[PDB]
């Protein structure tokens, strides 16, 4: 019965012996359905789900088929309908390619956008105080989506989605690999809001 979550382990100079990106975009998603699952740790994420013989690779299909496998399980729908609206500034662009279930394409553009924008401060996680500052602007840039709805730290206030998974996971993965200072520059620059969301997430962070 549970699903088989298959995953690699970090190893130092991560910090935390759990979870890349993608991993943790998926791992905060089977958490926030509630769906039982165990990881096996091997040397892209997969899960096989033995209740459908379903084998998926890649984080957004898995938490498209969890909600469409699952649309009541756990905290709710993790893709409700949703202006993702992002964009990359130009210098940014190139690490967008390759891009990207119709009514999710919001979502995968927003995917490749936050992948692309963090994509480009990594290096800072492999640092300098000229590539903190272009760390800095683009969370300037990602505070907007966040400041639209002041109920909550998420994007839809009191209420999580993919799309803040989407952010978390890159947030996650900074808190493991950026010395400590930057990452607390990172969480409390613009209004701390993504020390706050990523607080918020906190209880879908569970690694099992």
Avoid at 3 to 30: G, H, M
Avoid at 48 to 55: E, I, N, V, Y
Avoid at 163 to 185: C, F, H, K, N, Y
Wanted: charged share 20%; hydrophobic share 45%.
């Amino acid at each position: 019965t549970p699903i088989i979550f298959y995953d690699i382990a970090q190893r130092p100079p991560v910090a935390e012996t759990c979870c890349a990106v993608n991993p943790w975009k998926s791992r905060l998603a089977l958490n926030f359905k509630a769906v039982p699952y165990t990881t096996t740790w091997v040397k892209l994420p997969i899960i096989h789900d033995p209740a459908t013989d379903s084998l998926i690779g890649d984080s957004l299909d898995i938490a498209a088929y969890l909600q469409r496998t699952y649309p009541a399980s756990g905290a709710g729908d993790l893709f409700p309908p949703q202006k993702l609206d992002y964009a990359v500034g130009r210098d940014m662009q190139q690490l967008l390619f390759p891009l990207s279930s119709p009514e999710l394409a919001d979502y995968a553009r927003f995917n490749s956008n936050v992948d692309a924008a963090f994509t480009a401060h990594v290096g800072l996680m492999v640092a300098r105080d000229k590539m903190m500052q272009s760390l800095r602007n683009m969370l300037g840039d990602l505070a907007a989506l966040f400041r639209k709805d002041a109920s909550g730290p998420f994007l839809l206030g009191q209420r999580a989605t993919y799309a803040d998974m989407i952010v978390g996971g890159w947030l996650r993965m900074m808190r493991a690999t950026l010395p400590v200072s930057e990452w607390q520059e990172a969480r409390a620059c613009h209004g701390a809001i993504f020390g706050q969301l990523h607080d918020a997430l906190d209880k879908y962070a569970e690694v099992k």
